[PDB]
């Protein structure tokens, strides 16, 4: 019955995962991404145009990276975080799969 | 001559046009916006419903239901109007007013699902509606239903064969459902026995799942701007055994090339049309393809997208 | 098979569709939005320019110029793009952003004239532009230029003839330039020798100049909502010797019948398309026409009008 | 050399003609009518509101009637007014002739 101590790198990955889930997964973050996919951001910038698509890509890339860090780690706290990341990714992918078709 | 009994029978026989100022003159663009609802999807809006009649499941009292935020909604809407069916479409509430108006004028019943739930929200509601009265409602299922590639094999493919007189070398199509690519290739490779043909799928670089699939990599979809393709998964109506190759295209490449189609060729084109033609352009950089005849699909007209970023600079 | 050398060569062979829930089933609607720029005007955007080439007036360095706020601008724009010509369009500044965007994407040069001066303002500016360098610029003149009815005689008419197997009785077309009506009737009456044919012009009730003209009355035009017809005068390309009859349609009749084409027939239709079909409907009220075959022209798609009052609910 | 005295009816027609020209013919009245013809009328509720189309019809009908009243009157003041009406009608007719085609 083995359990390994998390390092800073892994404790960081867990911290960032729950953060980007709270702040970068809000409803208007997803709605914004969908409307950007329909071509209506609107593309003009009077400042703070925000490029929701780009943010959402970064959110995905981030989650996928922290998930990689925590995937095989023998700590249960790491595996719970890996689950939360995997879940978040599936929340996003279900929202945009098959959109616009 | 010909009198069509209703507008669904007018599908097809879209023109094949040489691109003169784009590429070297061997790019032949099939303009699929010349269709009753003006998209390549007109073809499956009709035969998905035709097929449903023939199988007998669609009969008095039975209404049609599909989740879609795209052209498939427009193609099902006009066919249900012409053949006298009750239609219900589910899409997220992100859909613009103007697009709603277009579907209502065609007599579709619209159910707007919760925006943050996205496209799964619509697919869910669609299943719940069919679940409420399985006898009354009929789900068309554009990604799985075999009627979709079938017309492309019965019509889209045959036309490409005939208009080129068997001399098509490369066939290029963006993949939304995969039906076009699958059915056309299935006609040219299978039925006319030309296995030489290079079938090239086009997807966005930001959701490159066909490239991931052909490399045995994990499937990692993302948001992109090319409307009509980039489903974010491998749809059942995409047969990979027919796919020789896949070219990923950036948002900017598709938009810039769409604009070139309208300004340099006189062809109204939406983003996905620029995408497919840009793939043909990338293929001509490889000097093995420079002398080959390339038929590329042009799914929609830019006019449909007139409020979008496709038209930016004044 | 067929490979078109450029998109202007793809015009025509628009479908003829039976209207099943509108009228008694003898109304055959020719859908002219199935065209490269998606309007009946596609036909003359091509052939007006083709003709200019054949006559030799259009050659290297020569640019095209026309006043138009309508579909003729879109038809000239895409053809000039496909055949590699420079196009300049004049229209009043009343033209919306979205419509400007559509013409620019097609590579047209847009000159917006003064709104209160209206359509004459544009016609003036176009002529001033041709006047600055009469060698460089070429004016197409859609209302006078005989290429306009000619293409309908060479293509549009033959199609109606062929597809109906000579059995067309009444032909109904709204009149913007008159080119469609003139040319089709000129093919069917003249060339196929059926003088039986009843050609019916459709105009708005609010600018009923064809009715005024056929009655010897003074010509008194007004504003109307049926976009694409109702020129407000008798254009040179309307030959009245071919016109057997004219039916006026109200704004409301056109809009309601346009909505019926989309919902009941699945056919995307603009106001003028509803108007022409409503004329066919009024003709079926007269019991002499009830057994007769009616071919009606459907000039444009409702999608083009999506921001307008055509969609009210 | 005959000149007839104008009556109440004709003096009225002359008055109405010059009024509708300053007040019911304005750039905003013609522009509004043009935009209504394109199917995009301005929403309620503005002063001198929509439908500009209906107003302009009323304006045309009015001018045409007063012109009829003053057409054959042997008075020079009537014929000058008839000219101003005829002129205004041509101003409007030149604005909308061939529009939208």
mmCIF file of N, CA and C in Angstrom, chain B residues 1-103:
data_model
loop_
_atom_site.group_PDB
_atom_site.id
_atom_site.type_symbol
_atom_site.label_atom_id
_atom_site.label_comp_id
_atom_site.label_asym_id
_atom_site.label_seq_id
_atom_site.Cartn_x
_atom_site.Cartn_y
_atom_site.Cartn_z
ATOM 1 N N UNK B 1 -38.836 17.763 -71.257
ATOM 2 C CA UNK B 1 -38.141 18.594 -70.283
ATOM 3 C C UNK B 1 -38.316 18.127 -68.843
ATOM 4 N N UNK B 2 -38.274 19.060 -67.892
ATOM 5 C CA UNK B 2 -38.406 18.686 -66.481
ATOM 6 C C UNK B 2 -39.282 19.635 -65.640
ATOM 7 N N UNK B 3 -40.306 19.070 -65.006
ATOM 8 C CA UNK B 3 -41.042 19.735 -63.938
ATOM 9 C C UNK B 3 -40.790 18.991 -62.630
ATOM 10 N N UNK B 4 -40.151 19.648 -61.664
ATOM 11 C CA UNK B 4 -39.907 19.022 -60.360
ATOM 12 C C UNK B 4 -41.163 19.067 -59.497
ATOM 13 N N UNK B 5 -41.513 17.960 -58.852
ATOM 14 C CA UNK B 5 -42.764 17.952 -58.100
ATOM 15 C C UNK B 5 -42.685 18.785 -56.820
ATOM 16 N N UNK B 6 -41.487 18.905 -56.247
ATOM 17 C CA UNK B 6 -41.242 19.816 -55.127
ATOM 18 C C UNK B 6 -39.767 20.166 -55.109
ATOM 19 N N UNK B 7 -39.399 21.193 -54.353
ATOM 20 C CA UNK B 7 -38.043 21.735 -54.418
ATOM 21 C C UNK B 7 -36.926 20.750 -53.980
ATOM 22 N N UNK B 8 -37.259 19.728 -53.186
ATOM 23 C CA UNK B 8 -36.239 18.758 -52.743
ATOM 24 C C UNK B 8 -35.655 17.944 -53.904
ATOM 25 N N UNK B 9 -36.397 17.858 -54.996
ATOM 26 C CA UNK B 9 -35.973 17.100 -56.160
ATOM 27 C C UNK B 9 -35.047 17.913 -57.063
ATOM 28 N N UNK B 10 -34.799 19.169 -56.698
ATOM 29 C CA UNK B 10 -33.960 20.029 -57.534
ATOM 30 C C UNK B 10 -32.490 19.982 -57.124
ATOM 31 N N UNK B 11 -32.166 19.115 -56.160
ATOM 32 C CA UNK B 11 -30.812 19.067 -55.619
ATOM 33 C C UNK B 11 -29.842 18.620 -56.693
ATOM 34 N N UNK B 12 -28.593 19.063 -56.570
ATOM 35 C CA UNK B 12 -27.514 18.559 -57.395
ATOM 36 C C UNK B 12 -27.229 19.301 -58.684
ATOM 37 N N UNK B 13 -26.417 18.650 -59.517
ATOM 38 C CA UNK B 13 -26.014 19.172 -60.823
ATOM 39 C C UNK B 13 -25.416 20.566 -60.662
ATOM 40 N N UNK B 14 -24.738 20.728 -59.529
ATOM 41 C CA UNK B 14 -23.903 21.875 -59.234
ATOM 42 C C UNK B 14 -22.755 21.948 -60.212
ATOM 43 N N UNK B 15 -22.382 23.168 -60.591
ATOM 44 C CA UNK B 15 -21.336 23.328 -61.602
ATOM 45 C C UNK B 15 -19.927 23.097 -61.063
ATOM 46 N N UNK B 16 -19.058 22.681 -61.973
ATOM 47 C CA UNK B 16 -17.655 22.501 -61.671
ATOM 48 C C UNK B 16 -16.921 23.588 -62.409
ATOM 49 N N UNK B 17 -16.221 24.438 -61.662
ATOM 50 C CA UNK B 17 -15.627 25.640 -62.244
ATOM 51 C C UNK B 17 -14.121 25.659 -62.045
ATOM 52 N N UNK B 18 -13.396 25.951 -63.129
ATOM 53 C CA UNK B 18 -11.949 26.109 -63.079
ATOM 54 C C UNK B 18 -11.563 27.386 -62.347
ATOM 55 N N UNK B 19 -10.647 27.274 -61.387
ATOM 56 C CA UNK B 19 -10.120 28.465 -60.740
ATOM 57 C C UNK B 19 -8.948 28.953 -61.572
ATOM 58 N N UNK B 20 -9.097 30.140 -62.151
ATOM 59 C CA UNK B 20 -8.073 30.708 -63.028
ATOM 60 C C UNK B 20 -6.952 31.493 -62.351
ATOM 61 N N UNK B 21 -7.300 32.341 -61.393
ATOM 62 C CA UNK B 21 -6.294 33.151 -60.710
ATOM 63 C C UNK B 21 -5.845 32.530 -59.397
ATOM 64 N N UNK B 22 -6.450 31.407 -59.021
ATOM 65 C CA UNK B 22 -6.039 30.700 -57.807
ATOM 66 C C UNK B 22 -5.462 29.350 -58.196
ATOM 67 N N UNK B 23 -4.194 29.123 -57.847
ATOM 68 C CA UNK B 23 -3.503 27.927 -58.288
ATOM 69 C C UNK B 23 -3.085 28.043 -59.746
ATOM 70 N N UNK B 24 -2.761 26.905 -60.339
ATOM 71 C CA UNK B 24 -2.199 26.856 -61.679
ATOM 72 C C UNK B 24 -3.230 26.588 -62.767
ATOM 73 N N UNK B 25 -4.493 26.468 -62.374
ATOM 74 C CA UNK B 25 -5.561 26.248 -63.334
ATOM 75 C C UNK B 25 -6.022 24.799 -63.369
ATOM 76 N N UNK B 26 -5.466 23.973 -62.500
ATOM 77 C CA UNK B 26 -5.937 22.604 -62.438
ATOM 78 C C UNK B 26 -6.889 22.379 -61.277
ATOM 79 N N UNK B 27 -7.155 23.434 -60.503
ATOM 80 C CA UNK B 27 -8.114 23.327 -59.398
ATOM 81 C C UNK B 27 -9.524 23.547 -59.904
ATOM 82 N N UNK B 28 -10.342 22.515 -59.758
ATOM 83 C CA UNK B 28 -11.716 22.561 -60.214
ATOM 84 C C UNK B 28 -12.605 22.568 -58.994
ATOM 85 N N UNK B 29 -13.369 23.642 -58.855
ATOM 86 C CA UNK B 29 -14.175 23.857 -57.670
ATOM 87 C C UNK B 29 -15.646 23.557 -57.944
ATOM 88 N N UNK B 30 -16.204 22.620 -57.185
ATOM 89 C CA UNK B 30 -17.603 22.266 -57.295
ATOM 90 C C UNK B 30 -18.397 23.156 -56.356
ATOM 91 N N UNK B 31 -19.271 23.964 -56.941
ATOM 92 C CA UNK B 31 -19.942 25.009 -56.204
ATOM 93 C C UNK B 31 -21.236 24.437 -55.671
ATOM 94 N N UNK B 32 -21.266 24.144 -54.379
ATOM 95 C CA UNK B 32 -22.376 23.382 -53.827
ATOM 96 C C UNK B 32 -23.381 24.316 -53.217
ATOM 97 N N UNK B 33 -23.120 25.617 -53.319
ATOM 98 C CA UNK B 33 -24.116 26.602 -52.902
ATOM 99 C C UNK B 33 -25.185 26.755 -54.009
ATOM 100 N N UNK B 34 -24.963 26.134 -55.171
ATOM 101 C CA UNK B 34 -26.026 26.140 -56.142
ATOM 102 C C UNK B 34 -26.865 24.921 -55.803
ATOM 103 N N UNK B 35 -27.817 25.137 -54.907
ATOM 104 C CA UNK B 35 -28.663 24.093 -54.367
ATOM 105 C C UNK B 35 -29.909 24.785 -53.841
ATOM 106 N N UNK B 36 -31.023 24.052 -53.685
ATOM 107 C CA UNK B 36 -32.262 24.689 -53.199
ATOM 108 C C UNK B 36 -32.140 25.537 -51.900
ATOM 109 N N UNK B 37 -31.499 25.072 -50.829
ATOM 110 C CA UNK B 37 -31.200 25.926 -49.659
ATOM 111 C C UNK B 37 -29.741 26.454 -49.667
ATOM 112 N N UNK B 38 -29.050 26.249 -50.783
ATOM 113 C CA UNK B 38 -27.738 26.871 -51.057
ATOM 114 C C UNK B 38 -26.535 26.376 -50.236
ATOM 115 N N UNK B 39 -26.508 25.079 -49.966
ATOM 116 C CA UNK B 39 -25.344 24.462 -49.347
ATOM 117 C C UNK B 39 -25.244 23.021 -49.790
ATOM 118 N N UNK B 40 -24.074 22.435 -49.609
ATOM 119 C CA UNK B 40 -23.866 21.026 -49.932
ATOM 120 C C UNK B 40 -24.840 20.136 -49.142
ATOM 121 N N UNK B 41 -25.343 20.660 -48.026
ATOM 122 C CA UNK B 41 -26.199 19.899 -47.119
ATOM 123 C C UNK B 41 -27.615 19.704 -47.634
ATOM 124 N N UNK B 42 -27.992 20.494 -48.642
ATOM 125 C CA UNK B 42 -29.275 20.314 -49.313
ATOM 126 C C UNK B 42 -29.443 18.870 -49.753
ATOM 127 N N UNK B 43 -28.329 18.290 -50.182
ATOM 128 C CA UNK B 43 -28.326 16.942 -50.702
ATOM 129 C C UNK B 43 -28.745 15.949 -49.627
ATOM 130 N N UNK B 44 -28.275 16.132 -48.396
ATOM 131 C CA UNK B 44 -28.642 15.185 -47.343
ATOM 132 C C UNK B 44 -29.915 15.596 -46.618
ATOM 133 N N UNK B 45 -30.347 16.838 -46.772
ATOM 134 C CA UNK B 45 -31.596 17.215 -46.140
ATOM 135 C C UNK B 45 -32.699 16.479 -46.861
ATOM 136 N N UNK B 46 -32.549 16.378 -48.179
ATOM 137 C CA UNK B 46 -33.530 15.681 -48.976
ATOM 138 C C UNK B 46 -33.504 14.167 -48.720
ATOM 139 N N UNK B 47 -32.402 13.511 -49.070
ATOM 140 C CA UNK B 47 -32.369 12.056 -49.027
ATOM 141 C C UNK B 47 -32.391 11.452 -47.622
ATOM 142 N N UNK B 48 -32.088 12.241 -46.606
ATOM 143 C CA UNK B 48 -32.209 11.716 -45.250
ATOM 144 C C UNK B 48 -33.702 11.547 -44.986
ATOM 145 N N UNK B 49 -34.496 12.467 -45.538
ATOM 146 C CA UNK B 49 -35.949 12.416 -45.435
ATOM 147 C C UNK B 49 -36.570 11.441 -46.456
ATOM 148 N N UNK B 50 -36.091 11.461 -47.704
ATOM 149 C CA UNK B 50 -36.513 10.473 -48.707
ATOM 150 C C UNK B 50 -36.380 9.038 -48.181
ATOM 151 N N UNK B 51 -35.170 8.710 -47.734
ATOM 152 C CA UNK B 51 -34.855 7.424 -47.146
ATOM 153 C C UNK B 51 -35.804 7.068 -45.999
ATOM 154 N N UNK B 52 -36.140 8.062 -45.177
ATOM 155 C CA UNK B 52 -37.009 7.822 -44.032
ATOM 156 C C UNK B 52 -38.401 7.404 -44.499
ATOM 157 N N UNK B 53 -38.821 7.941 -45.642
ATOM 158 C CA UNK B 53 -40.100 7.567 -46.240
ATOM 159 C C UNK B 53 -40.062 6.122 -46.724
ATOM 160 N N UNK B 54 -39.036 5.810 -47.513
ATOM 161 C CA UNK B 54 -38.845 4.475 -48.065
ATOM 162 C C UNK B 54 -38.766 3.379 -46.995
ATOM 163 N N UNK B 55 -38.132 3.679 -45.857
ATOM 164 C CA UNK B 55 -38.002 2.699 -44.770
ATOM 165 C C UNK B 55 -39.322 2.599 -44.003
ATOM 166 N N UNK B 56 -40.239 3.529 -44.279
ATOM 167 C CA UNK B 56 -41.583 3.472 -43.733
ATOM 168 C C UNK B 56 -41.776 4.050 -42.337
ATOM 169 N N UNK B 57 -40.696 4.506 -41.716
ATOM 170 C CA UNK B 57 -40.776 4.977 -40.333
ATOM 171 C C UNK B 57 -41.457 6.338 -40.297
ATOM 172 N N UNK B 58 -41.271 7.094 -41.371
ATOM 173 C CA UNK B 58 -41.890 8.404 -41.518
ATOM 174 C C UNK B 58 -43.200 8.235 -42.290
ATOM 175 N N UNK B 59 -44.297 8.524 -41.594
ATOM 176 C CA UNK B 59 -45.654 8.298 -42.070
ATOM 177 C C UNK B 59 -46.550 9.285 -41.322
ATOM 178 N N UNK B 60 -47.868 9.305 -41.613
ATOM 179 C CA UNK B 60 -48.748 10.271 -40.935
ATOM 180 C C UNK B 60 -48.593 10.374 -39.412
ATOM 181 N N UNK B 61 -48.525 11.614 -38.932
ATOM 182 C CA UNK B 61 -48.390 11.899 -37.517
ATOM 183 C C UNK B 61 -46.947 12.027 -37.073
ATOM 184 N N UNK B 62 -46.032 11.419 -37.827
ATOM 185 C CA UNK B 62 -44.621 11.418 -37.453
ATOM 186 C C UNK B 62 -43.933 12.734 -37.845
ATOM 187 N N UNK B 63 -43.275 13.359 -36.870
ATOM 188 C CA UNK B 63 -42.573 14.626 -37.052
ATOM 189 C C UNK B 63 -41.062 14.413 -37.029
ATOM 190 N N UNK B 64 -40.332 15.294 -37.702
ATOM 191 C CA UNK B 64 -38.874 15.217 -37.752
ATOM 192 C C UNK B 64 -38.212 16.052 -36.650
ATOM 193 N N UNK B 65 -37.096 15.539 -36.136
ATOM 194 C CA UNK B 65 -36.300 16.203 -35.106
ATOM 195 C C UNK B 65 -34.793 16.023 -35.365
ATOM 196 N N UNK B 66 -34.033 17.121 -35.366
ATOM 197 C CA UNK B 66 -32.574 17.020 -35.373
ATOM 198 C C UNK B 66 -31.892 18.134 -34.580
ATOM 199 N N UNK B 67 -30.840 17.794 -33.802
ATOM 200 C CA UNK B 67 -29.960 18.848 -33.296
ATOM 201 C C UNK B 67 -29.041 19.346 -34.397
ATOM 202 N N UNK B 68 -29.077 20.637 -34.698
ATOM 203 C CA UNK B 68 -28.065 21.247 -35.549
ATOM 204 C C UNK B 68 -28.034 22.770 -35.406
ATOM 205 N N UNK B 69 -26.837 23.355 -35.344
ATOM 206 C CA UNK B 69 -26.676 24.810 -35.435
ATOM 207 C C UNK B 69 -26.206 25.284 -36.832
ATOM 208 N N UNK B 70 -26.048 24.343 -37.753
ATOM 209 C CA UNK B 70 -25.457 24.626 -39.048
ATOM 210 C C UNK B 70 -26.423 24.552 -40.213
ATOM 211 N N UNK B 71 -25.862 24.319 -41.394
ATOM 212 C CA UNK B 71 -26.646 24.309 -42.613
ATOM 213 C C UNK B 71 -27.639 23.157 -42.657
ATOM 214 N N UNK B 72 -27.348 22.082 -41.948
ATOM 215 C CA UNK B 72 -28.227 20.930 -41.969
ATOM 216 C C UNK B 72 -29.614 21.302 -41.479
ATOM 217 N N UNK B 73 -29.686 22.246 -40.546
ATOM 218 C CA UNK B 73 -30.967 22.793 -40.138
ATOM 219 C C UNK B 73 -31.712 23.461 -41.294
ATOM 220 N N UNK B 74 -31.000 24.252 -42.087
ATOM 221 C CA UNK B 74 -31.591 24.901 -43.236
ATOM 222 C C UNK B 74 -32.028 23.869 -44.303
ATOM 223 N N UNK B 75 -31.228 22.836 -44.530
ATOM 224 C CA UNK B 75 -31.591 21.806 -45.512
ATOM 225 C C UNK B 75 -32.780 20.946 -45.060
ATOM 226 N N UNK B 76 -32.852 20.608 -43.781
ATOM 227 C CA UNK B 76 -33.998 19.850 -43.313
ATOM 228 C C UNK B 76 -35.246 20.718 -43.309
ATOM 229 N N UNK B 77 -35.084 21.990 -42.955
ATOM 230 C CA UNK B 77 -36.209 22.915 -42.860
ATOM 231 C C UNK B 77 -36.937 23.106 -44.176
ATOM 232 N N UNK B 78 -36.189 23.247 -45.266
ATOM 233 C CA UNK B 78 -36.846 23.553 -46.540
ATOM 234 C C UNK B 78 -37.494 22.304 -47.135
ATOM 235 N N UNK B 79 -36.884 21.141 -46.898
ATOM 236 C CA UNK B 79 -37.422 19.875 -47.396
ATOM 237 C C UNK B 79 -38.682 19.486 -46.629
ATOM 238 N N UNK B 80 -38.679 19.687 -45.317
ATOM 239 C CA UNK B 80 -39.879 19.429 -44.540
ATOM 240 C C UNK B 80 -41.003 20.375 -44.980
ATOM 241 N N UNK B 81 -40.637 21.564 -45.452
ATOM 242 C CA UNK B 81 -41.634 22.533 -45.884
ATOM 243 C C UNK B 81 -42.243 22.103 -47.210
ATOM 244 N N UNK B 82 -41.393 21.623 -48.111
ATOM 245 C CA UNK B 82 -41.793 21.218 -49.461
ATOM 246 C C UNK B 82 -42.547 19.884 -49.523
ATOM 247 N N UNK B 83 -42.206 18.965 -48.630
ATOM 248 C CA UNK B 83 -42.869 17.669 -48.566
ATOM 249 C C UNK B 83 -43.910 17.568 -47.442
ATOM 250 N N UNK B 84 -44.129 18.675 -46.735
ATOM 251 C CA UNK B 84 -45.209 18.765 -45.767
ATOM 252 C C UNK B 84 -45.011 17.991 -44.477
ATOM 253 N N UNK B 85 -43.851 18.154 -43.849
ATOM 254 C CA UNK B 85 -43.590 17.534 -42.558
ATOM 255 C C UNK B 85 -43.424 18.572 -41.472
ATOM 256 N N UNK B 86 -43.716 18.157 -40.251
ATOM 257 C CA UNK B 86 -43.486 18.988 -39.087
ATOM 258 C C UNK B 86 -42.015 18.809 -38.653
ATOM 259 N N UNK B 87 -41.279 19.916 -38.538
ATOM 260 C CA UNK B 87 -39.860 19.858 -38.179
ATOM 261 C C UNK B 87 -39.543 20.579 -36.879
ATOM 262 N N UNK B 88 -38.732 19.939 -36.053
ATOM 263 C CA UNK B 88 -38.228 20.577 -34.855
ATOM 264 C C UNK B 88 -36.704 20.485 -34.822
ATOM 265 N N UNK B 89 -36.063 21.634 -34.642
ATOM 266 C CA UNK B 89 -34.609 21.711 -34.576
ATOM 267 C C UNK B 89 -34.183 22.142 -33.180
ATOM 268 N N UNK B 90 -33.141 21.509 -32.660
ATOM 269 C CA UNK B 90 -32.567 21.965 -31.402
ATOM 270 C C UNK B 90 -31.218 22.581 -31.680
ATOM 271 N N UNK B 91 -30.992 23.771 -31.141
ATOM 272 C CA UNK B 91 -29.667 24.374 -31.175
ATOM 273 C C UNK B 91 -29.463 25.218 -29.925
ATOM 274 N N UNK B 92 -28.203 25.441 -29.530
ATOM 275 C CA UNK B 92 -27.935 26.369 -28.423
ATOM 276 C C UNK B 92 -28.434 27.786 -28.693
ATOM 277 N N UNK B 93 -28.757 28.512 -27.627
ATOM 278 C CA UNK B 93 -29.336 29.853 -27.718
ATOM 279 C C UNK B 93 -28.342 30.883 -28.248
ATOM 280 N N UNK B 94 -27.115 30.453 -28.516
ATOM 281 C CA UNK B 94 -26.111 31.325 -29.134
ATOM 282 C C UNK B 94 -26.461 31.713 -30.587
ATOM 283 N N UNK B 95 -27.379 30.968 -31.188
ATOM 284 C CA UNK B 95 -27.772 31.224 -32.558
ATOM 285 C C UNK B 95 -28.324 32.633 -32.678
ATOM 286 N N UNK B 96 -27.900 33.344 -33.721
ATOM 287 C CA UNK B 96 -28.282 34.738 -33.901
ATOM 288 C C UNK B 96 -29.760 34.854 -34.279
ATOM 289 N N UNK B 97 -30.313 36.055 -34.071
ATOM 290 C CA UNK B 97 -31.678 36.345 -34.450
ATOM 291 C C UNK B 97 -31.909 36.011 -35.911
ATOM 292 N N UNK B 98 -31.040 36.538 -36.765
ATOM 293 C CA UNK B 98 -31.231 36.413 -38.195
ATOM 294 C C UNK B 98 -31.252 34.966 -38.637
ATOM 295 N N UNK B 99 -30.449 34.136 -38.000
ATOM 296 C CA UNK B 99 -30.457 32.745 -38.383
ATOM 297 C C UNK B 99 -31.755 32.056 -37.931
ATOM 298 N N UNK B 100 -32.255 32.434 -36.753
ATOM 299 C CA UNK B 100 -33.554 31.958 -36.272
ATOM 300 C C UNK B 100 -34.682 32.293 -37.238
ATOM 301 N N UNK B 101 -34.708 33.552 -37.671
ATOM 302 C CA UNK B 101 -35.696 34.048 -38.622
ATOM 303 C C UNK B 101 -35.711 33.216 -39.892
ATOM 304 N N UNK B 102 -34.523 32.859 -40.355
ATOM 305 C CA UNK B 102 -34.410 32.118 -41.597
ATOM 306 C C UNK B 102 -35.048 30.740 -41.453
ATOM 307 N N UNK B 103 -34.856 30.114 -40.295
ATOM 308 C CA UNK B 103 -35.421 28.793 -40.097
ATOM 309 C C UNK B 103 -36.945 28.880 -39.895
#
